[model samples]
Target: SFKYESAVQYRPAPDSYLNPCPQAGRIVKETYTGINGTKSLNVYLPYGYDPNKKYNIFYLMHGGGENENTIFSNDVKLQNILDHAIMNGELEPLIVVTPTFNGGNCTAQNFYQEFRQNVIPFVESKYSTYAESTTPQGIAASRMHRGFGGFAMGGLTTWYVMVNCLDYVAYFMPLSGDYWYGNSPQDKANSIAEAINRSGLSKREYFVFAATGSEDIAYANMNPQIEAMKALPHFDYTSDFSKGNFYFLVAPGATHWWGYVRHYIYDALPYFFHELEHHHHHH
Candidate 1:
């Protein structure tokens, strides 16, 4: 007889200094139509969610074999991170949605399509995302208010969206993954440059933050991939994000686990909506 495999069992850590303030925000699970059928997601609404004001939105994707709720269930502490960030004034109040990407033989392309069509529509309809209209043009116009990030296989999906969906997004953070497996480093570089050129967008119009831990399984491939991206025509890769278009982060001794996943979210959230003030001047 063959044995059935089981997913990893995760246990939440005991209350620590990192837990959210007593007056933290809320997390709600919701359903929406997806590429294959009905799918679910978890939304983290900041402490003082207001209907009159528009908030920036971040879409977080989970790793392989994880469901929509994994980000919240696996001790990732996203809600806590957001709550504290907002209270401390490190970040503005924002809406964060973690949607399922593992339904009915989902491919990266399919997920990207559904995100643009179904997910964005649903989110914009329900929340005040500041999107002027639901049309592609409206979404493109409001790209400055949106950000996308993911982990593991989700990071691969992030790269897909970064290359293909720049019109509807401006900030991208790909954690622990890249598009270096099937293609050579040179080919990958060409594709990314070509994608940006096709979109008629310059590297100055958007930001890319690619991060991984020193011991992450994906770290080995990240180095070459980063080099490939840097070799593109006009992309200036720098350690100081304030001075460049791309920033690559490495956790000193962390690994590809939930512990470091929390840290990634903590670092990335404060940087959201940072460039929106200058976004209008570019157009």
Candidate 2:
């Protein structure tokens, strides 16, 4: 049997309350093979789950400057939402794994690299996750029994992971995540354009949900980039197998707060679970 561990530092006040789901939750800390130090991973298990049954999984990442606990406490309450989804038959029972991308106190670039090389693989090895299948059981051959989504920085990371590491994930949702290197108008537009052209987004099912409040500080800057993606060829609309497979939900009277994030997640839940449904049946 394969066994793994994580050594994450937990914030007691918020984490102790929000970290665990109704049925299962555990935190582990482990040193990745390629990285110099260790990273923390938070796992949420389904209610009355059985390893023998083989479960689908969702990797719910957190925003930047926030830790793994953020997805649990601040706004997403993702574990709770997932708990409800499973009980209601909206979503199949699955495992939710959230990990921190602190870069081992190194530079952002290194963090990105480690995310690609170490942290993700560590989780894949340890958990009973439904990573994509290849060949007869290979990529494009089996249903993507796994999904990935994130907010803010987590959202940005999700894009990088999905576009670059397509084999690792099946579905993608990046909420309110700005283009990492997009600075000026030209840079931002070009980044979105280049992402569409350069990013390996084809052949996969992805949905981008970007929500911005009227008065949010980042709204003015981020909106253009979101629109740029919408304007891409064959990307403006939503369906299966479409690029710019995006959903832009704007809250007229809001700010960059939990209210907007929660609403967007609620709205996006059907699509999220729908992807799971497609994969489960096809596989």
Candidate 3:
């Protein structure tokens, strides 16, 4: 059954998940030269990965003051949680790239350039992903199988990526950041509208999965930007992915910590590459 859920559940991942579980998937390290210089990122490959098979890839970035390791590192690893979700059939097997915007003096606005050159070529060439050809048109053709997401500043980067790289990515999960590039909320919304128009995408072609805590410090800014987006015709808001291209989740009592962001990521992750088109009832 397809449904639109706005109020999210306070589902704290169980404590036992704190224990490591390699069976869920494995994280591999990769070093690539980006805009600033050389850096490393981690890649989470589904357990029992087969090189012959192609997988959907998500380039997940980290927030300001955090590095690539923050998301999947042993201290705060999601491997245990994601492992079971896959085995239990609640989630599909896909590849996740936990990259950082930390080349020094860099943010989402400048990330798209490095992303286009370094991280993408290295990973897609070395790993097994849907991209058979790394050419511009080839990358654009496989956009739906790709996504980008993050927390706080990382989330802001997600929007920047959406604006600049929509041709290369279709699914977006911006956790708690706002479009800080613009002078006002309307300007931010207008910028994103321009992005969608530039891509020449249909309503069904791209997805914006945004979330924040009611108490998150960034909510004041993020919420207003979303309100501005609502006034534009390009964005239709609803939790039902089949009926709309965007939805925002505000978890009550949630804070601006990564602990809360992990849940937002967990909540939005499954919706990508999964659709309600078959049962929209307009049939």
Candidate 4:
């Protein structure tokens, strides 16, 4: 699937960790066809990226009013954090792309199909990833190598992807987002669990690393749904993704902003690809 990266505790990245590293991954701004029309995205390739090697791919989404440019060069300065981690061997080489839900035919509800049809095929074909082909079969075969996550509204997209895109994506990081389906919290939890049951995959086959701040605006909106999931049969709640595939991290005093959510990405992304790295090697 993908190689291992260091595990991060459910805490903030140190201030020094945000400094731009000399050895760093680079960003490429590119466009590909989506359901509506041509759309743009930013891609981060680890330093010394090689076409011969297949890297894990993460589709990171943006929150309300943000565009494709938000993560890499804009507010989050994510490449800096990523560069620091990977260069210091805290993280392995990976491909992280920032795609938006604000654009055409890419709302949170429909982005799962858009990702399966347009984003994955377009991104993986041009970049080196575990996908053997752009076909549905190819994407499904490489599910373990693919993850989707985001901040706020993007986090909403993340939840939708977990349930709807489960077949093509094994890793789900819904930072500061809750399931929007059904009216009540129980109904929301039930919808997600139902989707998992319908997928027919074992509990170990998929994972959700959900994060939010205790004081964040969406905290109450998300907390109940996550708490409800614990009572549901499908959710084995624990921070150790290997032992239990679902965990909700509440960062103390953090907010709804990307500044805080970026740390969640720092802490959570590693767990998604952790075990698969040891068993699979690609040359």
Candidate 5:
């Protein structure tokens, strides 16, 4: 058994609201060797997961104080939401891995290191992925089929991963999180621009689906960050998807609850793996 030091605490959504759709996917609990020791993760495979076919992968992060089980926990409706989306063809079938980032004072750099050295290797090895090899080039080449996302502190970690690991990820969904106000907007934008430049990837090669509830506590911090990113020279932000690479969705009257988190997944998952018709891979 693996354990982590929890940080902030969160209230689970009411049971009455759980999605009643019969579970349409398989959930597997597994452990892997990480920077801090052995850590556990919850993997969700769509109803018809096939090893013969390579599938897209989404590495979802749990909020602060929450462990890997946050999304799949009894009170959360994420499993149901995922099943419904896949069954209706709203979302392409994919594998979702929820891992714990609850280690004491879990920082972005720490998470990135563990992900690169442990999480990615462990998951990609056990599951069939687009990666041809575990090397940097192989991981970079498989970016088009990979996605990353998180909620609350997890969302903040998503931003960090985007800045530091852009070469290995092509789609990102950060819900209810923003760069720390202590860092200037320009600095944050510059970091992202630098990463994109380093990866030799065009702005159009990646998609960012940044969303938050209008009433989320982090809304105040998130709005300014969104505006700053839009102001970047390389990004063309627009409310209309046809007009830009960045998409923003603000849920009305929603809060920081798991319900809104599920809503974000419902809205974000559909748009993934849809834009990379000419998938680029580095040999």
Candidate 6:
């Protein structure tokens, strides 16, 4: 018996703008063997994308309690945002990869490790995109175009990956993340301070902007945590030496939901892309 195969069909009225470019399809379903069977990832390529031409990539991860698609469906207007940027010629066309971060047994530490060893390699191989380069290699050598942002737990993952794996990504936006786990607040600061101190790579082309909303549940602790991390003895002199690599913002009159996150994404995009462009052009 022969296997049955069916032709793929497109509904013009409804699918017309899902992906504007539509050459080779925008959203691609991919599978990566993780702890279990092949895990799935939704890869979105911009319109008019060519595999022969190299392009940058953004790893758009979703928050906790929400799966991968939340970034496109709820957290932010990513496709529309990118499409607008491309249409207006404000930003170069790039690839966006949204992957599932099943946080059941996966801790922030393990997840980041998987991103470096497995997720990154899979995406670069599956698509004709450049991998984000780290420090010491020089921005010219660093292939990492940029990383992603998320709310709540996803934000925590951003901090872990960008801070620890600076060699992998160039930019990061960590929104409303919590650092209360497995240690006292003071100890946590100490640990992070140690990493920053020991990280020998010059020109760590990365940014960690933690965003929170006035009405959000984490607002009360957000600023305080930021202050603590900044004031911690470990981070005291580092800023002067490193020229301040961290940023924290609190949005007034916002909530703990997607509304606040969306605002931050818009606010951060320009700065993020600017840095990315400059990093590529210069050192």
The candidate that wins on lDDT is 4
Q: Write the per-residue lDDT of candidate 3 for residues 1-283, one digit (tens) a residue.
A: 2234643454656666556664768789888876768888999999888999888888998888889888886645677777766666556788999988887656666887788777777888888877887777767777888899988888888888889998999899998888787899999999999889988998788889889998999899999999999888997887667678888888889999877777776777777775522122321
| Model 2 weakest 10-residue run by lDDT | 1-10
Which clashing pairs does model 1 show? Answer: none
Q: What is the TM-score of each candidate against the true structure?
A: 0.88, 0.70, 0.91, 0.93, 0.87, 0.73
Better of 3 and 4 by lDDT: 4
User: Which pairs clash inside model 4?
Assistant: none
RMSD of each candidate relative to the true structure:
8.7, 8.7, 3.1, 3.1, 7.8, 11.0
Give me the displacement of residue 57 in model 6, in angstroms: 2.2
Q: What lDDT score belongs to each candidate, Candidate 1 first? A: 0.75, 0.55, 0.80, 0.82, 0.76, 0.59
Please count the clashing residue pairs in each candidate, in the order shown. 0, 12, 0, 0, 0, 8
Query: Which sections of candidate 1 miss by over 4 Å?
Result: 1-17, 180-182, 239-242, 278-283
Cα shift from native, residue 271, model 5 (Å): 0.6
Per-residue lDDT of model 5, residues 1-283, tens digit only: 1111111112233443356556488989998777768778999998889988788899998887788998998767588878876776656689999987766444643586788777888888788778877777878888888989998888888888887788888888888988653477677777777777887878777778888888899898888777778888667674333345676678778899876777777766766665563345211
Q: Which 10-residue window of candidate 4 scores lowest in summed lDDT?
A: 1-10
On lDDT, who's better, 2 or 5?
5
In candidate 4, clashing pairs total: 0
In terms of TM-score, the best-performing candidate is 4
Q: Per-residue lDDT tens digits of candidate 1, residues 40-122?
A: 88888888888778888999898887878888773676677677667766567889999877676566545788889888888
Off by over 4 Å in 4: 1-9, 278-283
Best of the two (3, 5) by TM-score: 3
Ranking by lDDT: 4, 3, 5, 1, 6, 2
In model 3, the runs with Cα more than 4 Å from the true position are 1-10, 275-283
- Name the better of 1 and 3 by TM-score: 3
Q: List the residue pairs that clash in candidate 3.
A: none
Better of 2 and 4 by TM-score: 4
How well does candidate 3 match the true structure in TM-score terms? 0.91
For TM-score, candidate 4 versus 6, the one ahead is 4
